[PDB]
C-alpha cells in the first residue's frame, strides 16, 4: 500500500523541503509508472533539487498534482498540498541533503576518474610551487593517480591566512561566514561525507570510524549565510580555503590562458576540489560554490573564457533514488516510534 506508506511518511514532524521533494517524487513515480510522457518532469525536479531550488520544485510538484489527479490518490494529494505551505529547512539537520551530497561527491569522483590524463595536476604543481609561501612545502613528485591529485589540491590548505587575505578582503559575501569559533572538539563517526555521526545510514554506506570535528553555527552574527541560505547542510561554513585554490588557479590560468583545452582542465580541477571537500566533510556543495560564483571570483574565469561546470552532472538519478529510500526509511521509522510510544502510554494508562 504505497498511498498508506506515503501518508504515514508525511506525518513526520521533522519533515523539511528536501524530504518533501524526495517523498513526493517517490510517490508520483510509484503511482505514475515509467511513461515517456512523464519522464521530463522527474528529471526536471531532480535538477531543481540539485540546485537548492526548492520553492520552484515544490510549486511544480503541487501543479503536477493538480493535473493528472485522475491517476493519483485524492487524499494523498490533499495531504501533500496541506503539508507543503508549512515546510521549512533546517541547516543543522538537512539529513537527506547530506546523504544526497555525499553520494553525489562519490559519483563526481567516479566520473572525474574517467578523464583521459591527469596532466592538469602535473601542470598545476608548478603553479602551486610558484605561489606556495616560505612557511609551506614544495611538491616535486609526479602525479599518476587520483589520490595523489586529491592530496595535492588539499595541500593548498597551507596557503590560508598567508596569501589569500588580499583576495578575501576585496571580495564580499565572506563577512557572512557563520562557522562557530568555539572549539567543541572531535567526535567518533562512521558516516561518510558530510553526514552527521548520530544520524542513521545504510549498512553498505559505512566508512571506518574516525574522529570528525564538531562545528556549530554562530547565531549571533546577523544575516549569516545559514540564515539567508537555510536549504544547505551546514558542515563548516562558506568555504574559506577555496580562495587558496583560486589564487593557485589564477596563477595557472595566467600561465595557460592560451591553452587549447584550458576549460576542460579548470573544470577538472574545480570538480575534484568540490567532490573532495564533500567526500571528506570539510564543506557542502553550496558552501564551496557560493564562493566560486562570486562575481569578483568569476572575473578570473570570464577573462580566460572559462565555463565552470560547477560539478553539475548529466545523470544524478542514482543518489536521488538512494536519498528517496533514505527519507522513506526515516519517516516510516519515526511513525513507528510514535506508534510504539503511544502503545506503551496506553498500557501505562490502563495499569
Amino acid at each position: 500500500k504505497i498511498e498508506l506508506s506515503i501518508s504515514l511518511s508525511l506525518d513526520s514532524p521533522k519533515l523539511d523541503e528536501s524530504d518533501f521533494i524526495l517523498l513526493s517524487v517517490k510517490y508520483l513515480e510509484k503511482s505514475l509508472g515509467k511513461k515517456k510522457e512523464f519522464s521530463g518532469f522527474f528529471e526536471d525536479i531532480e535538477k531543481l533539487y540539485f540546485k537548492q531550488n526548492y520553492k520552484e520544485a515544490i510549486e511544480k510538484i503541487l501543479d503536477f498534482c493538480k493535473k493528472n489527479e485522475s491517476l493519483l490518490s485524492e487524499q494523498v494529494v490533499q495531504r501533500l498540498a496541506e503539508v507543503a505551505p508549512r515546510l521549512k529547512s533546517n541547516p543543522k539537520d538537512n539529513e537527506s541533503r547530506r546523504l544526497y551530497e555525499t553520494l553525489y561527491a562519490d559519483h563526481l569522483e567516479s566520473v572525474i576518474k574517467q578523464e583521459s590524463d591527469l596532466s592538469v595536476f602535473n601542470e598545476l604543481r608548478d603553479s602551486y610551487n610558484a605561489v606556495k609561501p616560505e612557511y609551506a612545502v614544495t611538491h616535486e613528485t609526479e602525479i599518476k593517480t587520483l589520490d595523489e591529485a586529491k592530496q595535492f589540491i588539499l595541500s593548498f590548505v597551507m596557503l590560508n591566512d598567508n596569501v589569500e587575505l588580499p583576495l578575501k578582503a576585496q571580495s564580499e559575501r565572506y563577512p557572512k561566514k557563520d562557522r562557530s569559533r568555539e572549539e567543541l572538539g572531535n567526535t567518533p563517526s562512521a558516516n561518510p561525507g558530510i553526514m552527521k555521526p548520530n544520524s542513521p545510514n545504510f549498512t553498505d554506506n559505512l566508512v571506518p570510524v574516525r574522529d570528525v570535528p564538531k562545528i556549530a553555527i554562530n547565531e549571533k552574527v546577523a544575516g549569516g549565510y545559514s540564515k539567508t541560505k537555510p536549504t544547505t547542510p551546514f558542515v563548516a561554513s562558506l568555504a574559506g580555503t577555496t580562495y587558496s585554490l583560486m589564487v593557485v588557479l589564477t596563477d595557472y590560468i595566467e600561465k595557460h590562458k592560451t591553452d587549447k583545452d584550458i576549460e576542460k582542465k579548470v573544470n577538472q580541477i574545480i570538480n575534484l576540489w568540490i567532490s573532495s571537500y564533500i567526500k571528506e566533510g570539510y564543506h557542502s556543495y553550496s558552501e564551496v560554490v557560493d564562493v566560486l560564483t562570486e562575481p569578483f571570483l568569476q572575473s578570473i574565469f570570464d577573462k580566460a573564457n572559462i565555463k565552470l561546470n560547477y560539478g553539475v552532472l548529466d545523470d544524478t538519478h542514482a543518489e536521488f533514488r538512494k536519498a528517496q529510500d533514505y527519507v522513506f526509511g526515516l519517516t516510516i521509522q519515526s511513525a513507528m516510534h510514535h506508534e510504539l510510544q503511544e502503545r506503551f502510554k496506553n498500557k501505562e494508562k490502563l495499569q
Binding site: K1, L4, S5, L8, T187, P188, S189, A190, P197, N198, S199, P200, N201, F202, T203, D204, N205, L206, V209, K322, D325, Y326, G329, I332, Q333, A335, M336, H337, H338, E339, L340, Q341, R343, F344
Partner: protein
C-alpha cells in the same frame, strides 16, 4: 496472517508469533550428525552419538547450511507453520557483516519463499520491548556480551562494543572452580549440570571482597545441589564467584574491561549531548543478565565510572531473558511496521542488497 518472529542465538533460538508475550518454541541452536542430521532438542537426546555444532559463534552466524537447517526446523517442526504464508522477521547481531545480512535475506526469499521479511538488531528490539528509542542496551547472552548505544532507533556503529564473554565462558569457569573443590566436571553432561547450577544458585555479589570475607567466615551462603546420579554437592562462595567473571574478566585469563567498563566505554564513544540520555536509559537483556543482584552491581559500577552529578538508571525487566523476542513482537504487530517489510517484489527488484536500504 500472523508474522513470525525468530530471534537467533549462539545457544538458544526463540521463535514465535507477533502479538504474543512469549515465544512458543525456545530450543537449542545445535545441529548434530552421527559420530542424517538432527536439529535442536532432537539432537539433544543423542548428544553422546552426535557432533553438536553451534552455527552462531559469538553472536555472528558462521555456518549457513546449519542455519538453513535450524530455520527449517523452526518453521516445519517448532512453530508448525509455513514461511510462505507469514512475514518472517529476523534478528541480527550488532555490527553484523553485510555479506551475512545479504545471505540471510537471500535464504529467506529463495529457499523458504517468505512473502516478506525484515532484519532487526537484537539490542534495538530489546530497547523497544521497554518502550524506548534512545538508550544503551547491554545484551549479554550465551556467546557474546554486546553493548549497543541506540539513538532514536539507530544503533550507532561508532560506539558498539563487543565482548567475547558470555554464559558459556561462565559455565566453563564454574566447571573449573568446581574441579578446584574436588568435583570432577569435565565432560559435556558435566557442562549441562554446571550450567544448571549456575542458573539456579549463582548470583552477582554487590561487594565481591566483602562477600568473599563473609563466605569464608561463615556458611550462610553455603547452598546444596543434587546430581542426576543422586550425589549431593555443596557450593559456597563459588555461587558469587562465577558471575564475577563478567565484572572482572581476568578470572578467565582475559584482558578485557568487564561489562560495566565496556558499557561506560561504549557510552563514552558517543556524543556529549546524548550521554545524559544514555546513562538514564541503560537497558539490560539476554540470559547472562538473569543474575540476582546484577542490576544493582551495574548501577554501582556505572555510578563509579560515570560523573558524579548525572543520574543513572539501570533497567532490568523481569522478562529480560526474552527482551529481544518480546521487542520483535511489539514490532511485528505494529500497524506502521506493516509498511517496513521487504516485499518479495522489492527483493526481485533490488537483489539481496535491498536489506541495506530497507532495514537500516
Amino acid at each position: 496472517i500472523a508474522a513470525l518472529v525468530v530471534d537467533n542465538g549462539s545457544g538458544m533460538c526463540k521463535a514465535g508469533f507477533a502479538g504474543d508475550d512469549a515465544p512458543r518454541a525456545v530450543f537449542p541452536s545445535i545441529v548434530g550428525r552421527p559420530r542424517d542430521s538432527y536439529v535442536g532438542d532432537e539432537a539433544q537426546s543423542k548428544r553422546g552419538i552426535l557432533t553438536l555444532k553451534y552455527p552462531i559463534e559469538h553472536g555472528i552466524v558462521t555456518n549457513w547450511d546449519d542455519m538453513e537447517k535450524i530455520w527449517h526446523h523452526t518453521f516445519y517442526n517448532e512453530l508448525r507453520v509455513a514461511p510462505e504464508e507469514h512475514p518472517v522477521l529476523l534478528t541480527e547481531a550488532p555490527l553484523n557483516p553485510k555479506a551475512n545480512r545479504e545471505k540471510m535475506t537471500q535464504i529467506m526469499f529463495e529457499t523458504f519463499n517468505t512473502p516478506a521479511m525484515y532484519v532487526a538488531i537484537q539490542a534495538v528490539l530489546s530497547l523497544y520491548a521497554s518502550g524506548r528509542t534512545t538508550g544503551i542496551v547491554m545484551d549479554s547472552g550465551d556467546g557474546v556480551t554486546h553493548t549497543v548505544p541506540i539513538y532514536e532507533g539507530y544503533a550507532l556503529p561508532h560506539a558498539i562494543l563487543r565482548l567475547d564473554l558470555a554464559g558459556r565462558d561462565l559455565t566453563d569457569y564454574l566447571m573449573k572452580i568446581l574441579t578446584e573443590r574436588g568435583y570432577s566436571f569435565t565432560t559435556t553432561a558435566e557442562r549441562e549440570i554446571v550450567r544448571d547450577i549456575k542458573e539456579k544458585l549463582c548470583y552477582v555479589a554487590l561487594d565481591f571482597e566483602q562477600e568473599m570475607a563473609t563466605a569464608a567466615s561463615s556458611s550462610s551462603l553455603e547452598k546444596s545441589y543434587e546430581l542426576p546420579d543422586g550425589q549431593v554437592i555443596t557450593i559456597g562462595n563459588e555461587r558469587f564467584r562465577c558471575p564475577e567473571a563478567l565484572f572482572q574478566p581476568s578470572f578467565l585469563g582475559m584482558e578485557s574491561c568487564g561489562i560495566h567498563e565496556t558499557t561506560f566505554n561504549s557510552i563514552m564513544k558517543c556524543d556529549v549531548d546524548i550521554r545524559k540520555d544514555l546513562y538514564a536509559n541503560t537497558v539490560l537483556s539476554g540470559g547472562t543478565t538473569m543474575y540476582p543482584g546484577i542490576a544493582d552491581r551495574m548501577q554501582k559500577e556505572i555510578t563509579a565510572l560515570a560523573p558524579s552529578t548525572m543520574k543513572i538508571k539501570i533497567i532490568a525487566p523481569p522478562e529480560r531473558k526474552y527482551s529481544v523476542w518480546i521487542g520483535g513482537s511489539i514490532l511485528a504487530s505494529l500497524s506502521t511496521f506493516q509498511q517496513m517489510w521487504i516485499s518479495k517484489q522489492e527483493y526481485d527488484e533490488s537483489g539481496p542488497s535491498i536489506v541495506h536500504r530497507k532495514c537500516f
